[PDB]
Amino acid sequence: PKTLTEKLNAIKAAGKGIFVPYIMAGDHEKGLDGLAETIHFLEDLGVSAIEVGIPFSDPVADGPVIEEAGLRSLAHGTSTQALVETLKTIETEIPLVIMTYFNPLFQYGVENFVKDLADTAVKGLIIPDLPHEHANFVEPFLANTDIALIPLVSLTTGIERQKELIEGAEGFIYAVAIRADLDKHLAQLHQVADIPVLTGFGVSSQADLERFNAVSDGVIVGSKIVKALHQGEPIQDFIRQAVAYQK
Amino acid sequence: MPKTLTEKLNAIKAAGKGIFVPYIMAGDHEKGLDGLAETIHFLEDLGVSAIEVGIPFSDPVADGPVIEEAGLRSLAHGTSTQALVETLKTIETEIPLVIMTYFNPLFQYGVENFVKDLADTAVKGLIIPDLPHEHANFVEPFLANTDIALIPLVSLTTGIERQKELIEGAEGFIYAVAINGNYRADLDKHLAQLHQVADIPVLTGFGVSSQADLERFNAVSDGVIVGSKIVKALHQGEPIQDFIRQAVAYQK
Amino acid sequence: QEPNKDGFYGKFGGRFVPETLMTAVLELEKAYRESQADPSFQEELNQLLRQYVGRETPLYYAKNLTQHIGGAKIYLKREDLNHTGAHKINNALGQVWLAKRMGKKKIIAETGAGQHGVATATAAALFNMECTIYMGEEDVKRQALNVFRMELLGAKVEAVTDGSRVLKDAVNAALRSWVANIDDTHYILGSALGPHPFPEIVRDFQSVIGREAKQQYRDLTGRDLPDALVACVGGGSNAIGLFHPFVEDESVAMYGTEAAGLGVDTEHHAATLTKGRPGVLHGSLMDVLQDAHGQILEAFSISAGLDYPGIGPEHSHYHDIKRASYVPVTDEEALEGFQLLSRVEGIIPALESSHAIAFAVKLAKELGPEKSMIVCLSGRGDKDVVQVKDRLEADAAKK
Amino acid sequence: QEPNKDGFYGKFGGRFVPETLMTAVLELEKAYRESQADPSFQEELNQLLRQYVGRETPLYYAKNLTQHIGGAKIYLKREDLNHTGAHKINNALGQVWLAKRMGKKKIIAETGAGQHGVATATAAALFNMECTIYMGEEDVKRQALNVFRMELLGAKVEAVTDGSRVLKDAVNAALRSWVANIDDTHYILGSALGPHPFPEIVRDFQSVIGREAKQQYRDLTGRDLPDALVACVGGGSNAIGLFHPFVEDESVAMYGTEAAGLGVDTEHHAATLTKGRPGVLHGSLMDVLQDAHGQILEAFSISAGLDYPGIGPEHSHYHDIKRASYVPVTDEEALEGFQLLSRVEGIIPALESSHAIAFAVKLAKELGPEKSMIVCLSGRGDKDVVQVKDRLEADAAKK
């Protein structure tokens, strides 16, 4: 029973919709020094968790807004080692879900990555290019730790394939898609899911967040929030209404 | 039985004089073939032995660059074998004329038509550079019982057996040609050897640009053919008249 | 096995792709096993390679080159004589014919220089199938002739405008297209570098090179085996196709020539196994040029066909178990090999293969007149004449 | 005999050359017979054609093209798969080998576009022979890339400043150099033109096209003979190489496709047998475009390799005795065939061969799906992509 699983199961039991913003580490004027400012900004808005990305030179599952933020972060010198050092000074009550492609993690060392984040707010881990068939590269290192390996499931795949990836999963489930045909796939997944399921689509308005709350357990927002913080646009009111949404 | 050209050139040789044959391109003139009479009488009054008269062809293979350009100049006027025949029928001269043509214009006109239409003209010889000995049956039968001699061309570097095969029964004169042009001493020896086995005058068609070149070749043959120097001079408006006088007057 | 069920050649390989892509790869491996069990699949593919591509390509004893170097006998496996002028067509043909068996109708791929784009468009035209080649916009504006070539062959050239508009963006554009249309589209991977089962599939379609060369060497010389095999490596397709049929013959040495650019100790090179360490890129665990923080470095080479940061995982396995040696060849050495073969043998080689010629000259002198080697002449160098001409004219002006 | 003692094919041919050139062609005929009486000469040439050029070229059933036309089955003799990418290498390699047997050490030739210059330079580098290619200076200025190719192969390109500085002047420069250096230099005529024995020598060395197709068609289809043969015709080397092995098979029809340029009745064409008549040119009595007074007319074609005013004497003989038909094919018709074969079969043909492809679709509709034809695909079209791309782009903005 890990922290991220229980923290999100409480948001679902309280009638609220899970809201997980997706930021990119180092994407700031001050670089990684502004990460504490960014996480504490989103904490006052009451977000369920915070997805923090590690910039990679060859991303494969990122949109054009996120990839543009990763390159903006690489200029300041953001690295896995530099983020782990910054997270040791981050104090927050929001659970952090570190997103990274496997190679920056593979070079740093999976075990070193876990041991050096034990006393931090890192509670979940997303590795888009690490399939279930290579979980042995990471899962053995997450035993007896408070870090949950987030599984990603494609809604258009067979239900036996989905139940195979959800078996024993902790934290939450990330729903991805290659518009009304998805609702049947995502509701069937919520039926056989024991932990919350989250939708990581391109929600741009309040109607998109509500369209998936009838079938999932929450949404993940990245492009809209990353682009708003970069261009200096209003986002603070959009996050308030999303948290306070009642189901 | 004997061709006129053989006897006329033997007379020059008999008088201790070198045979001098200018080479001009018919139609290479300000007014085309209409200037052929003027050019011939200009050379006749200088006392030349014979006149080689060329028929321009679009793809020559045996002419030097000066003669190649003269052929291009002449074709612009529209010079054809047919029109030259018409011009030659109006040309009165005591000098024997030797037609130079590549085989195709002659072949298109018809060799028999060419020979018969030139029966009562000053045409006494015929040079076809690209009609070798192996294809002489295209022309030789039609030249029988006429006054037009088929001029054979001989390469000096070939064997004396091959050269004698080309000379067999030739009339008019033998046209000695050489590839390109020490080396010049071997030419004079090969040229003098052809002069022995030959029974008609042997003329040199090499580089003749001065009186020294002319007198060098007369020591081993019977005369020279001058083309490029006369063609270039007549077209460029350069002096050539005195060069021909000294050439004609050369006492062997 | 090699590879095992997880797609690993010793320590390297794998299927490190997102779950959205795993279904396409699992379907691919399933159907590929079906093609290996059906004898008609090889009988048909063998005849088309014979009739259409021109196989078997001869193993040419380079007599002049051998006497000029004065050492080992040099035999050239003449992949330059293939239709399209390179070895890529072997793999594009097999994979499109595999897609025909799978009931697919559309063929897609990406390319940078344009060689794999041309080969894929050629194979698609042969089987009367739709083809779209994804190409970065910066590559499209610089390869107008290969883009026109691909259009001549009936293929659509999709100019990728998103991202930095390079080969890196074209791979993403092509892979997203493959999953979205997995019911009708197949994706052709260009080299032996990628997620399982692609390195295995590419090796087997390219094994006609080494399979023909083994028998042709015996027919031509009466001897049993060559002493060494030389081939250039980009992703590793033409080299592993030469190496693999000889893998169980211990007496046969193997050499793969890496692009060393301006110098291995400089910042502009592509020597993966010389200056790289194991990483995870393009869905595979391989040796790759990277900094200390895992960021993939950019590779440079006079031959654009060799500037790939990684290398096929089976080569990383060959390199780890000492089965094959991997030696770097600078641009200058390849530029001389390009001119050496053109003048000595009258064969204008590809700039890629010129790296193999350059090393074979060194190796032939070292082995001595009593030995023999087979060099893979992976392609012809008509595509490189313009570049070499400008390079030679620029080098003469500066010096 | 064909040719007879004096080199005539029926009424056509011979050696209408000056006496200064007669010595060279007599020596060449003597040396040629001695090479035919020697079995070791043809054996060494066969092995080199096999291992270096890649013979035999396949006879590929153009299944897609056949289904597209809905007419006769089309089989393509894949001469485009030769080393150098065209048929010309068959003649040049055979003539360099003959030059080595004669004890010569220098090889010379002329070229216009550059095709024969590259083939000759390739065959000279194979045999380690000094090579000099004569080009008109105006052609050197327009073919800087082919000049670099020939120099890459070790040949010296001598620009001819004399006269108009075109191909007509390079021919004379090369012939004058041949006579001057006869004791150690052999001149390689590129086509089935010229004085005896050149048309006979070029025919025999190119007869590997038809002899292979005849045996390949039987082993492939199980039938005895194809119903028709089609080849493009410049001077006639590749056509006569395909026709001659079938000349005694009366049921096999023969078609040579002439370059009609802008139109047979226009001022810009190269339809020798459609608009010409017999004359004497280049040392041979042959059909040739000429005016009423015997002056040779200029030939025009979109393909530089077919703009010759004349045609081989053996083709004029075939046309005289009605053994072969000769059909004009226009510039635009050849462009359609170039684009058609590219997308339907994946083979980019030369502009020369595109004339045969274009007439192939015409003849295919006429014969119906119950008949078969062999088309000689003389070359690949990489050398023509630049010209075709400009032509289609210029016409796009203009229409």
Side-chain angles (χ1 to χ4, degrees), chain A residues 1-177 180 182-185 187-208 210 212-236 238-246, chain B residues 2-178 180-250 252, chain C residues 1-137 139-165 167-181 184-397, chain D residues 2-397:
Chain A
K2 294 181 179 55
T3 303
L4 182 62
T5 309
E6 303 180 12
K7 282 267 195 173
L8 298 180
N9 268 326
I11 306 292
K12 176 185 176 180
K16 291 177 52 191
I18 298 171
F19 193 78
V20 178
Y22 172 34
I23 50 169
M24 180 66 49
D27 178 17
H28 198 266
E29 284 189 346
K30 307 183 300 177
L32 273 175
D33 299 322
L35 181 70
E37 163 184 341
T38 298
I39 299 185
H40 292 167
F41 162 76
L42 298 158
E43 183 168 10
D44 284 327
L45 303 171
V47 295
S48 309
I50 294 293
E51 186 174 345
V52 181
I54 293 185
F56 184 47
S57 61
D58 297 68
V60 296
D62 279 331
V65 184
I66 300 299
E67 292 185 352
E68 198 159 358
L71 286 189
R72 203 181 306 108
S73 168
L74 287 183
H76 293 97
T78 299
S79 60
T80 288
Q81 178 188 10
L83 175 58
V84 173
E85 183 184 5
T86 301
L87 292 177
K88 289 183 180 180
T89 62
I90 304 294
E91 269 233 326
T92 179
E93 296 297 323
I94 304 297
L96 299 180
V97 186
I98 301 290
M99 199 291 302
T100 179
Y101 294 91
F102 187 58
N103 188 64
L105 177 57
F106 190 66
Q107 300 299 313
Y108 186 90
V110 185
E111 182 159 70
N112 303 340
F113 187 77
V114 171
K115 301 285 189 176
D116 292 333
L117 290 174
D119 292 323
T120 65
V122 173
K123 311 296 184 180
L125 189 67
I126 304 177
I127 317 167
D129 63 329
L130 187 66
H132 169 73
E133 282 71 12
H134 297 327
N136 53 282
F137 283 77
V138 157
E139 274 184 351
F141 303 86
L142 291 180
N144 290 342
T145 63
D146 200 30
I147 297 180
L149 186 65
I150 304 308
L152 271 69
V153 166
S154 169
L155 308 175
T156 61
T157 63
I159 191 60
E160 306 175 22
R161 175 69 183 184
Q162 301 188 14
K163 295 161 56 181
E164 181 182 354
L165 315 183
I166 304 312
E167 264 290 320
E170 305 214 27
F172 70 93
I173 302 163
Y174 197 132
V176 294
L182 284 176
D183 297 322
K184 184 185 62 179
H185 286 105
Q188 179 195 18
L189 172 60
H190 190 207
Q191 170 186 356
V192 301
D194 288 39
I195 65 179
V197 300
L198 269 60
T199 287
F201 296 168
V203 287
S204 72
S205 65
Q206 286 282 328
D208 322 328
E210 296 175 323
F212 301 119
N213 278 133
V215 37
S216 66
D217 294 324
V219 303
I220 298 181
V221 190
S223 313
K224 175 179 175 60
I225 301 182
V226 170
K227 182 178 183 177
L229 300 174
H230 176 248
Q231 297 176 341
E233 293 301 289
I235 191 65
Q236 183 183 153
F238 168 78
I239 304 179
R240 293 189 204 275
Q241 301 180 9
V243 175
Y245 167 78
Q246 220 69 52
Chain B
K3 297 300 200 305
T4 298
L5 184 64
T6 311
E7 308 167 343
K8 284 296 190 61
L9 296 174
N10 280 325
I12 297 292
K13 173 177 184 170
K17 286 181 53 192
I19 294 168
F20 188 79
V21 177
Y23 175 34
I24 57 173
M25 181 65 66
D28 178 26
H29 192 278
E30 281 185 3
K31 44 185 189 175
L33 286 169
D34 290 335
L36 184 61
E38 167 189 330
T39 308
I40 291 182
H41 298 154
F42 167 77
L43 298 164
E44 175 172 359
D45 297 334
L46 297 177
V48 297
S49 316
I51 299 292
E52 186 175 342
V53 174
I55 295 183
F57 179 53
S58 67
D59 294 68
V61 287
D63 286 316
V66 170
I67 307 302
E68 291 182 358
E69 294 299 329
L72 283 183
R73 292 176 242 142
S74 181
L75 291 174
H77 285 89
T79 301
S80 63
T81 306
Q82 174 186 233
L84 172 60
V85 167
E86 178 189 1
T87 301
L88 284 176
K89 288 178 178 173
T90 70
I91 298 306
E92 290 192 341
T93 175
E94 307 287 355
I95 304 302
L97 303 179
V98 181
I99 292 300
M100 195 299 302
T101 177
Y102 293 86
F103 184 49
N104 187 52
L106 175 57
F107 184 63
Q108 303 298 321
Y109 189 91
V111 178
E112 175 170 327
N113 299 318
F114 180 84
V115 172
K116 295 190 174 182
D117 292 340
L118 263 38
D120 295 325
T121 67
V123 170
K124 301 300 172 181
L126 180 55
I127 297 175
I128 315 170
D130 63 346
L131 187 70
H133 175 66
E134 279 64 20
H135 299 295
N137 58 312
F138 279 80
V139 174
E140 257 175 3
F142 304 103
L143 298 188
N145 288 90
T146 66
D147 203 16
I148 296 180
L150 188 57
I151 304 302
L153 272 64
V154 181
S155 180
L156 286 188
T157 63
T158 53
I160 200 71
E161 300 182 9
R162 165 69 175 190
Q163 301 188 20
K164 290 170 65 183
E165 181 179 10
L166 315 180
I167 302 311
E168 192 81 357
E171 305 207 58
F173 71 95
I174 296 154
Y175 197 141
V177 298
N180 207 283
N182 192 39
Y183 171 80
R184 316 193 180 189
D186 297 328
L187 280 183
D188 302 334
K189 207 176 71 174
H190 265 146
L191 190 51
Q193 186 182 358
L194 174 68
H195 196 187
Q196 168 197 349
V197 302
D199 288 326
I200 58 178
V202 173
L203 269 51
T204 297
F206 306 164
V208 185
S209 68
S210 75
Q211 286 291 148
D213 304 341
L214 174 140
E215 70 185 25
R216 159 195 170 192
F217 290 136
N218 280 280
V220 295
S221 65
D222 303 306
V224 299
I225 297 184
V226 179
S228 291
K229 186 182 178 67
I230 299 175
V231 169
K232 172 190 175 68
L234 291 177
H235 177 241
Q236 290 194 328
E238 301 298 329
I240 197 64
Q241 189 178 22
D242 213 30
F243 160 81
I244 301 177
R245 295 197 171 279
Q246 303 188 10
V248 169
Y250 179 76
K252 215 89 158 188
Chain C
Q1 277 280 33
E2 214 196 285
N4 53 26
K5 316 167 192 183
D6 298 307
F8 281 102
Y9 306 81
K11 301 157 52 183
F12 302 91
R15 301 160 290 188
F16 292 90
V17 295
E19 172 67 21
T20 159
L21 204 145
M22 280 294 306
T23 57
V25 140
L26 293 170
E27 288 186 5
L28 175 59
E29 182 181 5
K30 171 60 180 178
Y32 180 64
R33 304 312 174 185
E34 297 179 8
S35 68
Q36 296 177 306
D38 179 21
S40 74
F41 188 82
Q42 274 298 332
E43 294 182 13
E44 180 79 2
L45 186 64
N46 289 0
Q47 188 67 8
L48 285 176
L49 291 173
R50 180 172 191 263
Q51 297 300 284
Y52 180 73
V53 177
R55 312 206 65 92
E56 307 172 341
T57 56
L59 183 69
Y60 171 68
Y61 174 49
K63 207 169 187 294
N64 297 345
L65 183 63
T66 292
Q67 299 172 2
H68 174 69
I69 298 312
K73 298 190 173 187
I74 301 174
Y75 298 84
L76 302 181
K77 180 60 178 172
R78 301 286 306 281
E79 295 302 301
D80 67 294
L81 301 184
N82 274 343
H83 180 219
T84 72
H87 67 278
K88 287 180 162 48
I89 184 59
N90 294 336
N91 174 60
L93 216 62
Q95 287 194 33
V96 173
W97 175 230
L98 174 68
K100 193 89 166 181
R101 183 184 175 93
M102 298 192 306
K104 302 297 195 305
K105 308 301 186 307
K106 195 194 215 307
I107 295 290
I108 63 174
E110 89 280 340
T111 185
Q115 285 301 98
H116 180 236
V118 170
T120 301
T122 299
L126 176 72
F127 294 102
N128 198 19
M129 289 182 59
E130 183 186 348
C131 184
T132 297
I133 303 298
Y134 294 87
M135 201 176 181
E137 185 181 350
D139 287 317
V140 176
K141 301 297 173 57
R142 197 166 53 259
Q143 307 286 352
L145 277 72
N146 287 21
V147 172
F148 181 71
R149 269 186 167 93
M150 288 176 286
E151 288 172 354
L152 273 181
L153 299 166
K156 176 175 182 54
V157 174
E158 192 80 60
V160 184
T161 57
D162 310 330
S164 50
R165 305 174 179 181
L167 181 63
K168 188 189 306 181
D169 293 275
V171 177
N172 284 327
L175 292 176
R176 297 179 198 278
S177 182
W178 187 27
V179 180
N181 311 271
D184 54 88
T185 304
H186 174 55
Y187 172 82
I188 317 277
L189 232 182
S191 190
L193 189 156
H196 182 74
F198 269 121
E200 180 180 356
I201 291 178
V202 172
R203 173 196 71 190
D204 296 355
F205 287 150
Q206 289 296 346
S207 285
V208 302
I209 301 178
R211 187 176 302 117
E212 291 171 1
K214 167 174 270 196
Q215 186 69 21
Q216 282 169 327
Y217 182 82
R218 287 160 171 163
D219 290 341
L220 182 61
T221 69
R223 310 184 205 103
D224 179 33
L225 292 171
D227 300 279
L229 305 169
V230 179
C232 68
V233 294
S237 63
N238 89 91
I240 198 67
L242 175 67
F243 291 167
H244 178 66
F246 289 95
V247 67
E248 302 295 338
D249 302 319
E250 290 84 8
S251 54
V252 174
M254 298 176 176
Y255 300 89
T257 72
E258 307 184 307
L262 304 177
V264 151
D265 293 323
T266 71
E267 208 179 14
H268 305 77
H269 69 77
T272 300
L273 287 159
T274 301
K275 307 290 271 191
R277 64 182 189 280
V280 180
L281 180 66
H282 293 127
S284 181
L285 176 49
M286 75 189 56
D287 290 289
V288 65
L289 291 173
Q290 44 174 341
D291 72 332
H293 303 293
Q295 307 303 314
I296 305 300
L297 297 166
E298 183 183 357
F300 178 76
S301 173
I302 188 183
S303 187
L306 300 181
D307 58 23
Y308 293 95
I311 196 180
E314 196 166 14
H315 288 290
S316 294
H317 177 61
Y318 274 43
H319 173 252
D320 188 45
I321 72 173
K322 303 279 198 167
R323 184 61 187 97
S325 311
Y326 293 91
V327 288
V329 175
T330 68
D331 299 337
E332 206 64 26
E333 291 167 327
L335 189 64
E336 176 59 35
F338 179 94
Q339 308 179 242
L340 181 64
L341 191 70
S342 304
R343 162 187 56 253
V344 171
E345 288 290 343
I347 303 174
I348 301 193
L351 274 178
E352 294 88 344
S353 322
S354 294
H355 293 78
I357 299 297
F359 178 75
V361 159
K362 306 173 191 295
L363 180 71
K365 185 172 168 184
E366 177 191 342
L367 289 193
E370 307 302 325
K371 303 297 184 183
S372 301
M373 79 176 61
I374 295 178
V375 185
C376 181
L377 190 48
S378 56
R380 55 176 161 86
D382 294 276
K383 66 180 183 62
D384 297 289
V385 163
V386 173
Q387 176 182 352
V388 164
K389 183 184 188 301
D390 299 337
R391 167 64 176 262
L392 290 179
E393 293 169 0
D395 290 341
Chain D
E2 240 121 276
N4 61 16
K5 174 156 156 290
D6 294 327
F8 286 101
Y9 302 80
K11 317 171 181 62
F12 301 93
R15 36 166 64 110
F16 297 84
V17 297
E19 173 64 27
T20 49
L21 187 52
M22 183 56 55
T23 306
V25 297
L26 286 175
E27 159 184 306
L28 183 64
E29 184 176 18
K30 178 185 178 182
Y32 185 55
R33 307 309 179 192
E34 301 174 358
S35 82
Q36 285 172 308
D38 189 347
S40 75
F41 180 87
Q42 193 62 50
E43 167 57 32
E44 174 81 3
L45 177 57
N46 284 0
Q47 201 64 19
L48 285 171
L49 287 173
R50 187 179 181 274
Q51 302 296 138
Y52 182 72
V53 173
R55 304 214 70 90
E56 41 203 62
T57 62
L59 180 62
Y60 167 65
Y61 172 52
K63 183 185 169 71
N64 295 337
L65 184 57
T66 294
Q67 294 185 340
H68 177 267
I69 310 300
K73 299 187 179 186
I74 299 176
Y75 297 86
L76 298 178
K77 183 57 175 164
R78 304 291 311 284
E79 292 303 300
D80 60 292
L81 296 188
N82 287 324
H83 178 59
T84 68
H87 66 278
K88 284 189 175 46
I89 188 53
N90 296 326
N91 172 47
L93 209 169
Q95 284 201 45
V96 173
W97 185 214
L98 175 59
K100 208 161 187 60
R101 189 193 171 84
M102 298 179 65
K104 305 296 178 77
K105 299 178 181 178
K106 298 177 187 286
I107 296 298
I108 64 174
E110 93 264 331
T111 191
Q115 274 298 84
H116 180 54
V118 165
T120 300
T122 297
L126 172 73
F127 284 96
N128 303 113
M129 302 216 204
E130 195 183 297
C131 189
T132 301
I133 304 300
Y134 291 87
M135 295 186 68
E137 188 178 20
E138 296 306 279
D139 279 327
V140 177
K141 298 180 176 177
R142 296 187 290 264
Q143 306 293 341
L145 207 69
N146 286 334
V147 171
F148 176 78
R149 271 187 177 86
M150 287 176 288
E151 295 177 339
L152 208 47
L153 298 161
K156 169 60 182 173
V157 175
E158 195 84 47
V160 179
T161 60
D162 312 321
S164 295
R165 309 177 183 88
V166 213
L167 177 61
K168 296 179 52 172
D169 307 85
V171 172
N172 286 341
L175 284 176
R176 280 190 270 269
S177 178
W178 189 30
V179 168
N181 306 281
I182 186 56
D183 52 327
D184 72 333
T185 301
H186 170 57
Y187 164 85
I188 299 186
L189 193 47
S191 199
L193 307 155
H196 185 67
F198 274 121
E200 185 186 356
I201 293 172
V202 180
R203 173 196 71 182
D204 294 345
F205 286 151
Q206 293 293 354
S207 291
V208 302
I209 301 177
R211 292 199 298 260
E212 290 171 7
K214 188 174 188 178
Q215 187 65 25
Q216 283 165 323
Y217 179 84
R218 289 168 178 167
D219 303 342
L220 191 70
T221 71
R223 306 152 212 162
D224 190 35
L225 298 170
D227 296 280
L229 307 170
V230 170
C232 65
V233 170
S237 61
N238 89 84
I240 206 61
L242 172 66
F243 294 163
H244 174 65
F246 297 89
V247 68
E248 280 182 316
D249 299 308
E250 295 172 316
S251 75
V252 183
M254 300 174 174
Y255 301 87
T257 71
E258 310 184 303
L262 265 45
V264 127
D265 294 328
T266 78
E267 313 291 334
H268 307 278
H269 68 73
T272 297
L273 290 169
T274 300
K275 302 289 287 192
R277 74 183 188 273
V280 168
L281 174 67
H282 291 150
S284 182
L285 179 48
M286 58 166 64
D287 289 291
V288 50
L289 302 175
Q290 50 174 320
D291 70 342
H293 309 285
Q295 312 296 347
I296 311 300
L297 296 174
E298 192 177 8
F300 298 83
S301 178
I302 188 180
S303 177
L306 302 180
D307 58 21
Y308 292 86
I311 194 179
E314 192 157 6
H315 288 294
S316 294
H317 176 57
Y318 282 18
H319 178 260
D320 193 21
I321 68 177
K322 315 292 185 177
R323 182 62 187 88
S325 313
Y326 293 85
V327 290
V329 180
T330 66
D331 274 8
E332 287 288 338
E333 276 163 341
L335 256 186
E336 304 174 36
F338 179 95
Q339 309 178 47
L340 184 75
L341 195 69
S342 294
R343 63 179 303 160
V344 172
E345 289 291 344
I347 313 175
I348 297 182
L351 277 176
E352 289 88 356
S353 321
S354 294
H355 288 66
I357 293 291
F359 177 79
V361 320
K362 287 184 179 182
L363 183 65
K365 305 170 184 174
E366 176 181 347
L367 303 180
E370 307 295 325
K371 305 303 174 60
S372 294
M373 72 196 289
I374 297 187
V375 187
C376 176
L377 185 50
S378 48
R380 55 163 196 255
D382 293 77
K383 67 187 180 58
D384 293 316
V385 178
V386 169
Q387 180 192 355
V388 170
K389 165 176 155 60
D390 296 338
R391 162 127 185 181
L392 293 174
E393 282 170 349
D395 188 271

